[PDB]
Design a binder for this molecule. Structure first.
Ligand SMILES: O=C(O)[C@H]1C[C@H](O)CN1c1ncnc2[nH]ccc12
Length: 167
């Protein structure tokens, strides 16, 4: 039993809700919140810009030190950093950004990072400003993640479409 509330159960391990991931994290304080990161951990817009703003830019400060030490992530890769005031940890995961020409096949590799964590609060990778089809992202999530994932979909219209079209 965990403290997530109001989610629709899609499969044995995937749950979905129309919610602002920032407000959800603040309420639940999950062990792991997933950020929709880029390889430079430059948290400018979308989910990443929103999470970082909620940390008063502390996420960006920590991220800049991470990059200065380690260099950029790989597309499809991840790193674990602090969750600041939002969660214990933040798993920064880089899905392919179609608006950059990146291979959508890397979306499965991106979701594989979730399997290293027993429970996560997450967005749909590569959706929104990353330019992929969210219906496809949800399908890859369900077919790749085996740990317990609580998906927050900001757009209510999109949430309704994601639910109605789920196979
Ligand atoms: O449009 C949406 O609903 C999704 C898809 C996109 O990739 C990011 N976005 C979000 N999802 C959940 N919480 C969020 N807080 C701020 C933005 C946001």
């Amino acid at each position: 039993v965990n403290s997530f509330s109001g989610y629709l159960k899609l499969t044995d391990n995937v749950y979905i809700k129309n919610a602002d991931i920032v407000e959800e994290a603040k309420k639940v304080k999950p062990t792991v919140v997933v950020n929709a990161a880029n390889v430079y951990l430059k948290h400018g817009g979308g989910v990443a810009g929103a999470l970082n703003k909620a940390t008063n830019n502390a996420m960006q400060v920590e991220s800049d030190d991470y990059i200065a030490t380690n260099g950029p992530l790989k597309v499809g890769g991840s790193c674990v950093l602090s969750g600041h005031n939002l969660a214990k940890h933040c798993l920064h995961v880089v899905g392919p950004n179609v608006n950059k020409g990146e291979d959508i096949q890397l979306l499965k590799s991106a979701y594989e990072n979730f399997n290293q964590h027993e429970v996560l609060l997450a967005p749909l990778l590569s959706a929104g400003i990353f330019g992929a089809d969210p219906i496809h992202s949800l399908r890859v999530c369900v077919d790749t993640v085996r740990t317990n994932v609580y998906l927050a979909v900001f757009d209510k219209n999109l949430y309704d479409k994601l639910v109605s079209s789920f196979l």
